[PDB]
């Protein structure tokens, strides 16, 4: 509750007391020591899930995938004490992280054996069996989507930064469609405010009736942002949320822009994306009445390195919405190419 | 943006970037000082308003009144040096600060001459004249309410190199029933939130579902709390806001409680108030279906010093909702004495 700050526009500095919110995206976080319940209980859950037709998992957040990847080996070594022949196999992740109709259960009992799950001093190995328990990757054929799980972990405590940086988790006991609360924080000071979490950071400004300023996106979640953690909820309709409600956008008057509607066909397959309201390099976003209609977002960069400069639209208000990705510039649905074809270009695979 | 943030919860030192609340209420004058626009144009305004019969502005906030009883002297001097005949006066405010109908004008130009700010300006004294432009004061009989003023000032910037704030201000040209947005801040981080103003500090928490935790009130405004600085403004109706909407309460689920409704007849005249959900000393609030209905707020201390030790109600989530005042402890409307008549106890002033 106690601390300090230092302003930038004015140089006044002061310590005091209050409530403090921090940015935790640009550095991709540090490396931490995750403690998912007792990894033995997680292993028992992975068994009882296979027994009932669950054959894989699709991560809800990159933290979940990294926890899986970092506990893969001990997961395989923890079941071999008893009569279980499963073999987890963790691959890379893809964007966006489509949902899963199943849910990992909650075991009432646990595999009786040693407690050696945490921090085994090296020398951990196991023998590969016939049947896998895949996690992400290209294992679609081995385990069809309808048999995959999604969104079954709930944070509990993430302190211990001075000496252990330990983040604790658990398997959630109830069905739900909304993101994790404990890692969300939002604040407002006069003419500015922000919504954010571990992977989401959203900024709003008081220009006139408030609007959307900027946002940085390293993953593409697909949960729903809780309403208790958003500003000025009522009076808004879901047809005008710039970040679709399906991609965990918040319902707010700060989450919008005059002239633009929900962006459901955007480049949600890129690895990293920055939402910025400004014209991309070489671009001249005109305003025309003869221009076309909404359509899938078209990258400004061709697979051959070619780019298209002139785009038009009717309903837009400058500056224009654009996504910045390591691949290149991706524009919004409203702004279509002014004369160039909408198909002889690197079109976003339909993200509807 | 960078800050200490010594996280008292985990005893963890931190650093980074973000946004920070500050509890600038309790350390009221250790930080804040207020001065208006150039008192020459303010003098011109008060001159062009007296033509319409303005009695003189009653303050909405302690900042405005404490500016009133700071800039009087040079305002009087600037009035006199121009040949104008008027005497500005100031008294002691009384809670609550009622809603006056009129509004100050805005001069199109300044007086061509008058620079009495120079030299020993503040301390020039002159006799009292026939014309009184009374600010605040006990002149309620001398000037009826309808000719007063209310809410005629805006904040534009604050923070200066004098190691204390120098809040710039100026006269309003716009009609408005809304509280000031520049000096208000709120935020939520995990399981904690806070609604903060220069005289209001309101704390909310997530137990089961969001609710109200504590409030510290040094003044009792009567402007409307803006919505854009409010969390979860949806699906809530005015009948349950514990702090009445008319007395500058925020419309939120965080500003509610189970078993309580709007408190219109609370002790909104006291010098200093704090809302704490704990029983007043020497008392215990029961819940019974046989208790009486709503009524005026009743203090727990009799005029002779005696206190009552039995209270009841029907619909309250037990036990307390109490206001902490300089002269005693005030209970809520829904809680009323069990044996003593309401006639003997000190009763809240008429604030319906």
């Amino acid at each position, epitope marked *: 509750d106690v601390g300090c700050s230092v302003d930038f526009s004015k140089k006044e500095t002061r310590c005091g007391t209050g409530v403090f919110i921090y940015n935790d995206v640009e550095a991709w976080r540090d490396r931490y020591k995750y403690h998912p319940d007792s990894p033995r209980r997680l292993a028992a859950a992975v068994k009882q899930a296979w027994e009932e037709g669950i054959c894989g998992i699709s991560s809800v957040s990159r933290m979940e995938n990294i926890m899986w990847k970092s506990v893969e080996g001990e997961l395989n070594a923890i079941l071999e004490e008893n009569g279980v022949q499963l073999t987890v196999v963790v691959g890379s992740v893809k964007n966006p992280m489509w949902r899963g*109709p199943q849910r990992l259960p909650v075991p009432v009992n646990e595999l009786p054996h040693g407690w050696k799950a945490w921090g085994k001093s090296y020398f951990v190995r196991a023998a590969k069996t016939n049947n896998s328990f895949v996690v992400d990757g290209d294992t679609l054929k081995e385990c069809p989507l*309808e*048999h995959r799980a999604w969104n079954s972990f709930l944070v509990e405590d993430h302190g211990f930064g001075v000496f252990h940086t330990s983040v604790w988790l658990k398997v959630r006991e109830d069905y739900s469609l909304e993101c994790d609360p404990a890692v969300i924080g939002t604040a407002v000071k006069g003419r500015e405010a922000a919504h954010s979490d571990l992977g989401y950071w959203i900024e709003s400004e008081k220009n006139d009736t408030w609007r959307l300023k900027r946002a940085h996106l390293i993953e593409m979640k697909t949960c729903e942002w*809780p*309403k208790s953690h958003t500003l000025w909820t009522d009076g808004v309709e879901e047809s005008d949320l710039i970040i679709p*409600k399906s991609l965990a956008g918040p319902l707010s008057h700060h989450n919008t822009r005059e002239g633009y509607r929900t962006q459901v066909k955007g480049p949600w397959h890129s690895e990293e994306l920055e939402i910025r309201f400004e014209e991309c390099p070489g671009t001249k976003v005109y305003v025309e009445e003869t221009c076309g209609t909404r359509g899938p977002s078209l990258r400004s960069t061709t697979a051959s390195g070619r780019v298209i400069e002139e785009w038009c639209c009717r309903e837009c208000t400058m500056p224009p919405l654009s996504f910045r990705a390591k691949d290149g510039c991706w524009y919004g649905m409203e702004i279509r190419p002014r004369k160039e074809p909408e198909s002889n270009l690197v079109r976003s695979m339909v993200t509807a | 943006d960078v800050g200490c943030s010594v996280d008292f919860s985990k005893k963890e030192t931190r650093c980074g970037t973000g946004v920070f609340i500050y509890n600038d209420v309790e350390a009221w004058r250790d930080r804040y000082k207020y001065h208006p626009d150039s008192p020459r144009r303010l003098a011109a305004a008060v001159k062009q308003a007296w033509e319409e019969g303005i009695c003189g502005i009653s303050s909405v906030s302690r900042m405005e009144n404490i500016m009133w009883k700071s800039v009087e002297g040079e305002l009087n001097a600037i009035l006199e040096e121009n040949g104008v005949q008027l005497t500005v006066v100031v008294g002691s405010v009384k809670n609550p600060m009622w809603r006056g109908p009129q509004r100050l004008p805005v001069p199109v130009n300044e007086l061509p001459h008058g620079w009495k700010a120079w030299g020993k300006s503040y301390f020039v004294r002159a006799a009292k004249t026939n014309n009184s432009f009374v600010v605040d004061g006990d002149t309620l009989k001398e000037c009826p309410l309808e000719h007063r003023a209310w809410n005629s000032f805006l904040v534009e910037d604050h923070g200066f190199g004098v190691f204390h704030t120098s809040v710039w201000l100026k006269v309003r040209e716009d009609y408005s029933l809304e509280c000031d947005p520049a000096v208000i801040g709120t935020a939520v981080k995990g399981r904690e939130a806070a609604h903060s103003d220069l005289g209001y500090w309101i704390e909310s928490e997530k137990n089961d579902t*969001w609710r109200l935790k504590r409030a510290h009130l040094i003044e009792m405004k009567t402007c409307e709390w803006p919505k854009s600085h409010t969390l979860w403004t949806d699906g809530v109706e005015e009948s349950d806001l514990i702090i009445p909407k008319s007395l500058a309460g925020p419309l939120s689920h965080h500003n509610t409680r189970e078993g309580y409704r709007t408190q219109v007849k609370g002790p909104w005249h006291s010098e200093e108030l704090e809302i704490r959900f704990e029983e007043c000393p020497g008392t215990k609030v029961y819940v019974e279906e046989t208790c009486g209905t709503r009524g005026p707020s009743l203090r727990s201390t009799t005029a002779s010093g005696r206190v009552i030790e039995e209270w009841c109600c029907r619909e309250c989530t037990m036990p307390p909702l109490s206001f902490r005042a300089k002269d005693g402890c005030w209970y809520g409307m829904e809680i009323r004495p069990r044996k003593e008549p309401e006639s003997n106890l000190v009763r809240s002033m008429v604030t319906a």
Partner: antibody, heavy 116, light 109 residues
Framework: SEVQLVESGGGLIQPGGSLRLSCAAS????????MSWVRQAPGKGLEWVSV???????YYADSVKGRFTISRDNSKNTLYLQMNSLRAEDTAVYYCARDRRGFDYWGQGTMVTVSS | SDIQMTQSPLSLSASVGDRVTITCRTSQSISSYLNWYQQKPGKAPKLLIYAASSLQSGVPSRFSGSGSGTDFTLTISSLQPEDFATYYC?????????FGGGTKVEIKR
């Protein structure tokens, strides 16, 4: 007890009147589940009215916006729907359903008639 | 915008021992959130098949479903006298939780 939903509070009301429906629940808490209201007209299909999440958020069907309001009493574990400005075309049988991985539990229903 | 849930056929005729096929269609990819309910005249619906491939506990093993994307299906291996009712499909993906247009199966003659 067994998991069930039991409505009550139907009858005959003149146009423009008002009424409030109650759907009790047992075997689980409304606060940690997703609950809905479903209605079917005589001789027609099913239709969904409203939902109240476990986090408190609520959504309503377009045709009943403003006029209706869904809430719950956490002490008695009850689910409420407020019916104001009843029309003639609001005649149907109303059910409450629980969502876990599909509306796997339903209530018998209650009949509401609006005739002058 | 909401999601439409057309059904077909409106009604079909088939005798005991036949194999019947019904189709429910949706206007955009709802992942695999599809439900099938069996309502008899004047009764509340009940759930047969969820997840588009899974089987609610207790349902007899003659029911099965399949499909992906915008096209799903349901089938009964050996229709029986007591299966004279209507079948509604539903999706619990995003609000509003729309229902289907209904189909009535003539078990006899």
């Amino acid at each position: 007890s067994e998991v069930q939903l039991v409505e009550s509070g139907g009858g005959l009301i003149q146009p423009g009147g008002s009424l409030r429906l109650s759907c009790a629940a047992s075997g689980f808490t409304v606060s940690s589940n997703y609950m809905s209201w479903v209605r079917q007209a005589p001789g027609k299909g099913l239709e969904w009215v409203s939902v109240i999440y476990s986090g408190g958020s609520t959504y309503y069907a377009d045709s009943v916006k403003g006029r209706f309001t869904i809430s719950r009493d956490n002490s008695k574990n009850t689910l409420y729907l407020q019916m104001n400005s009843l029309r003639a075309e609001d005649t149907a049988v109303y059910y409450c359903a629980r969502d876990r991985r599909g509306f796997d539990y339903w209530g018998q229903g209650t009949m509401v008639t609006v005739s002058s | 915008s909401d999601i439409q849930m057309t059904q077909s056929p409106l009604s079909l005729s088939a005798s005991v021992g036949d194999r019947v096929t019904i189709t429910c269609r949706t206007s955009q990819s709802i992942s695999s959130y599809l439900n099938w309910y069996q309502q008899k005249p004047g009764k509340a619906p009940k759930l047969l098949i969820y997840a588009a491939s899974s089987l609610q506990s207790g349902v007899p093993s003659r029911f099965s479903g399949s499909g992906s994307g915008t096209d799903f299906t349901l089938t009964i291996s050996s229709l029986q006298p007591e299966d004279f009712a209507t079948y509604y499909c539903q999706q619990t993906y995003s609000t509003p939780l729309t229902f289907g247009g209904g189909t009535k199966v003539e078990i006899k003659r």
